[PDB]
């Protein structure tokens, strides 16, 4: 009969700070109850009307988060294997949700930033192999399936067969190899054999593969209207939806006889969308991961660059086009030599023979008053005015100064500031997301997406037909031992601080004056 | 003598000098056979590159060049992020523009040239405009297929190039130069600046500790130059075929003990005059004062 | 900072109050003339300038809804732009 959890839930719902901390320190099952307290307080703080009381609830939820961090830090510092059984324990509080899922739902990013939690996610990622095996041994065992039964891959953190092919690293590695073979087949169809009359054998293999990828995205979109709200929420579910919609528009346009070239180009832009998927597939990796995350935070500085450049590119381009007006005055021709010459001049392509009379041969080539010169090039105009050409050379010099020295070196300065400012928060965000990415590979039907139709048939058939108790007591008493040592050391550190020594001296001198008088 | 072979296999530059000599033996052995002259002629060229990169390890002893050579190998994870993001973007751009204006020379190494090797040189300022832009090419009925075609200039650019939707090829050039030359290069400078200012202090601490064993290596070497070093190896082969004062140490150690005692007395005075131990001693004096009243 | 931390609407009526001291000059104009740059750096003052900038719409309406309503004047009378501050 331990009713301490009823008084904990009572003190959390009425927002009593000192009550809820005391009721935490007396009850058991402490790591899960601190994550449950942090979750419940943040849910009720978003639902709060008064601003001061929502601020009060977010301060208390931050206190419970730091206590679960400090307690699990000491439980991990004693024994790694036993603390691993402490996090991964089924349904400690309020339904089947482990401590990692309570840390995920509460947005407790300081709990995932520990070295103990990241070590347990590394052990979970490698399955039932050892987490120190190098990646080349994983590659040699992957491309040689009989080489599993040797002394390269040490196990224990037809049995070794499902110890190799059951780990999340080999579901990842099989997914990457199958996705690169999809791109290699896509490129072979698009660059070598794309017949105008009838689709060949290799293109029908491509259409079959894209049907398997479509059924995979409906399986992650259904396996029901709130689930569609969740699939519409992400940006990369929308991007894989975007790749498949451009694919259907390309194949549907190709099959009509009057629209061959339109589908021929829509599939090329579709190839770019499928290859940018690979930036999201490798966010699970330990070295490439966090750096891919920081790239999307560097895009407000690129947009300042494009703003300042487009103001300056219009100013330079229309001025030099007006100064030496040419004789080919088509609309796309002048849009070429207004926007597209100066954009390539900031990358080192400076055409001097198109806009400088000293490099051109003169002549009476126009039908108008004035002196004219004949440029070289099929797009540079046909005759160019010679009046005030030193001003065109000065506008080139000023353009190269402002574009290549101000804007490029200032952009390097802004990228350096933004990077050193957001780098720490991007590490904290990546570790918290690293749990749910691993859980995605562990929850996937482990069969490669060219051959994944087998598992979708089996799930279609199933859709047509519709610790021990003493081990938990030993575990929780072990946790309560370390909770008491944590709280005693916290009390000794507060008592030996300098300000409470100053309080205790002040009260002793005050009672000394009470003894004299 | 087998544990010494474990030590020689342990280092990376003992392995590299082993690597230079193994490529040398493969080059000389291939040269002497009559049917393999050109193979040894090229293996010795790559071997020349491996011998010249030794000079980066010889000058880690130097006082100015030393620590900076050490920091260079710690900057290689950011180069590998650059090569990852670039290869994703280089395949995306190259296969799209090759598909959009399909050419008529469709050899395998020819299309691998103009898929991987054109865009890699476009990030260094080599932008060939007359090979992929219909406004700069002369048109003509140069193919044997339905559609409008144009004839590029260059022996590797294809022979006929499709004119359909060429404004999309010009837009893919503009987007490529934006992502490659502005994002990836300026972001790489930002990551090198962060990594450098983060690992610079630990690389100084590592270099000073290694600076002892490098000096000891030159002091332990037979001092005769490696063109003429056969003399010292003959002399060591002959030798292999045939098989302070006490009062000065007492004065030294008593001098050390004098400075040990002054060090410990100053450490005790600094701890005693600190503010927290003054606060302890006042607290205990007031407590014994209450014991004297009561 | 504390008057804003209690109630946002009532502190908005506190800054924007006509002629509190020495002629018609509100607290924002006294902060402007004094060069009090630490007073404008608050999150309360910048939130009230965001509400003043958007007029009598809501300050959370995205810019594309403003563009669609600008280039389609009959599209004002729909449920895109929520009014009352
Ligand atoms: Na440059």
UniProtKB/Swiss-Prot annotation, chain C:
Organism from which the protein derives: Mus musculus
Domain notes: TRPM4, is a temperature-sensitive ion channel, it adopts distinct conformations at different temperatures, markedly influencing where and how ligands interact with it. Decavanadate (a positive modulator), ATP (an inhibitor) and Ca(2+) bind to different locations of TRPM4 at physiological temperatures or at lower temperatures.
PTM comment text: Phosphorylation by PKC leads to increase the sensitivity to Ca(2+). Sumoylated. Desumoylated by SENP1.
Knockout or disruption consequences: Mice have fewer dendritic cells in lymphoid organs and impaired migration of dendritic cells is seen.
UniProt record similarity statement: Belongs to the transient receptor (TC 1.A.4) family. LTrpC subfamily. TRPM4 sub-subfamily.
Expression tissues: Sino-atrial nodes (at protein level). Widely expressed.
Name the record gives this protein: Transient receptor potential cation channel subfamily M member 4
Subunit relationships: Homotetramer.
Role this protein plays: Calcium-activated selective cation channel that mediates membrane depolarization. While it is activated by increase in intracellular Ca(2+), it is impermeable to it. Mediates transport of monovalent cations (Na(+) > K(+) > Cs(+) > Li(+)), leading to depolarize the membrane. It thereby plays a central role in cadiomyocytes, neurons from entorhinal cortex, dorsal root and vomeronasal neurons, endocrine pancreas cells, kidney epithelial cells, cochlea hair cells etc.
Name of the gene this protein is made from: Trpm4
Full-protein residues shown: 628 to 712 of 1213
Cell compartment(s), UniProt: Cell membrane; Endoplasmic reticulum; Golgi apparatus
Domain of life: Eukaryota
């Amino acid at each position: 009969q331990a009713p301490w959890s009823d008084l904990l839930i009572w003190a959390l719902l009425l927002n009593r700070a000192q009550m809820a901390i005391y009721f935490w320190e007396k009850g058991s099952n402490s790591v899960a109850s601190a994550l449950g307290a942090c979750l419940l307080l943040r849910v009720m703080a978003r639902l709060e009307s008064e601003a001061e009381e929502a601020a009060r609830r977010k301060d208390l939820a931050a206190t419970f988060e730091s206590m679960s961090v400090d307690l699990f830090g000491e439980c991990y510092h004693n024994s790694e294997e036993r603390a691993a059984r402490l996090l991964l324990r089924r349904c400690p509080l309020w339904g089947e949700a482990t401590c990692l899922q309570l840390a995920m739902q509460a947005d407790a990013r300081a709990f995932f930033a520990q070295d103990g939690v990241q070590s347990l996610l590394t052990q979970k990622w490698w399955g039932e192999m050892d987490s120190t095996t190098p990646i080349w041994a994983l590659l040699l065992a992957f491309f040689c399936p009989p080489l599993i039964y040797t002394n390269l891959i040490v196990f224990r953190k037809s049995k070794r067969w499902s110890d190799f092919w059951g780990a999340p690293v080999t579901a990842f590695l099989g997914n990457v190899v199958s996705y690169l073979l999809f791109l290699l087949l896509f490129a072979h169809v698009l660059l070598v054999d794309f017949q105008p009359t009838k689709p060949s054998v290799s293109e029908l293999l491509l259409y079959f593969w894209a049907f398997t990828l479509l059924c995979e995205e409906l399986r992650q979109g259904l396996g029901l209207r709130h689930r569609l709200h969740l699939y519409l929420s992400d940006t990369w579910n929308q991007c894989d939806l975007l790749a498949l919609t451009c694919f259907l528009l390309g194949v549907g346009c190709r099959l009509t006889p009057g629209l061959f070239d339109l589908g021929r180009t829509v599939l090329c832009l579709d190839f770019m969308i499928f290859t940018l998927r690979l930036l999201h597939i490798f966010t699970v990796n330990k070295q490439l991961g966090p750096k891919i995350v920081i790239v999307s935070k560097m895009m407000k500085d690129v947009f300042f660059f494009l703003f300042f450049l487009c103001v300056w590119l219009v100013a330079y381009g229309v001025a030099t086009e007006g100064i030496l007006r040419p004789q080919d005055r088509s609309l796309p021709s002048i849009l070429r030599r207004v926007f597209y010459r100066p954009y390539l001049q900031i990358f080192g392509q400076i055409p001097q023979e198109e806009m400088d009379v000293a490099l051109m041969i003169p002549g009476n080539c126009s039908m108008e008053r004035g002196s004219w010169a004949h440029p070289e090039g099929p797009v540079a105009g046909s005759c160019v005015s010679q009046y005030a050409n030193w001003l065109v050379v000065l506008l080139l010099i000023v353009f190269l100064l402002v574009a290549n020295i101000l804007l490029l070196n200032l952009l390097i300065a802004m990228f350096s500031y933004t990077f050193s400012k957001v780098h720490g928060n991007s590490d904290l965000y990546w570790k918290a997301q690293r749990y749910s990415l691993i859980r995605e590979f562990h929850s996937r039907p482990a069969l490669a997406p060219p051959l994944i139709i087998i598992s979708h048939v089996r799930l279609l058939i199933k859709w047509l037909r519709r610790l021990s108790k003493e081990a938990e007591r030993k575990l929780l008493t072990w946790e309560s031992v370390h909770k008491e040592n944590f709280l005693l050391a916290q009390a000794r550190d507060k008592r030996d601080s300098d300000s409470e020594r100053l309080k205790r001296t002040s009260q002793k001198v005050d009672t000394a004056l009470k003894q004299l008088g």
